[PDB]
Curated annotation (Swiss-Prot):
Moderately expressed in fetal brain, spinal cord, skeletal muscle, thymus, spleen, fetal liver, small intestine, colon, kidney and uterus. Highly expressed in adrenal gland, prostate and testis, as well as in brain and cerebellum. It comes from the Eukaryota. The lineage of its organism: Eukaryota, Metazoa, Chordata, Craniata, Vertebrata. This is Protein unc-80 homolog. Belongs to the unc-80 family. The chain holds residues 1345 to 1642 of 3258 of the full protein.
């Protein structure tokens, strides 16, 4: 569903710029979906990514044609990074509050094994730093000077 929303948002922000394109209701939902995860389990981000990959493989097998296969091979690398990337597409519309709302999840998803999720989190965190440098600086200072070796590493 998040993927579908992503394409909707991309169409709307790539055609109305050539209001609907100034406010979007679902963004908040995306933010929650990104924060509604366990970064320490039954709902750990690793398990969610594995489930997404399994679903992708199953769907590929089902459509095992050129159209869907190519789309999944180019536009949907994995399902798990769908919400974050969505927020990337609608970055200009995001208010300064939702940047700080999404910052923790982007920070926590930076070490994901999946390359796509890592890249999406990196992009989101960089944009957050661009828009709200103070929060990013405070978080970085707290993290580097942390009393736990694991955290610093």
């Amino acid at each position: 569903a998040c993927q579908l929303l992503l394409e909707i948002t991309t169409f709307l922000r790539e055609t109305f710029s050539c209001n609907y394109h100034r406010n979007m209701s679902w963004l908040h939902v995306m933010i929650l979906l990104c924060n509604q995860q366990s970064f320490i389990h039954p709902h750990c981000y690793l398990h969610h990514s594995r489930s997404c990959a399994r679903l992708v493989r199953a769907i590929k097998l089902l459509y095992g044609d050129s159209g869907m296969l190519k789309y999944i091979r180019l536009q949907v690398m994995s399902l798990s990074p769908a919400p974050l990337s969505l927020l990337i597409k609608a970055a200009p519309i995001l208010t300064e509050e939702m940047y700080g709302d999404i910052q923790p999840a982007a920070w926590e998803l930076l070490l994901s094994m999946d390359e796509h999720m890592a890249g999406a989190a990196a992009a989101m965190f960089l944009l957050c730093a661009v828009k709200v440098p103070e929060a990013v600086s405070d978080m970085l200072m707290s993290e580097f000077h942390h009393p736990e070796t694991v955290q610093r590493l």
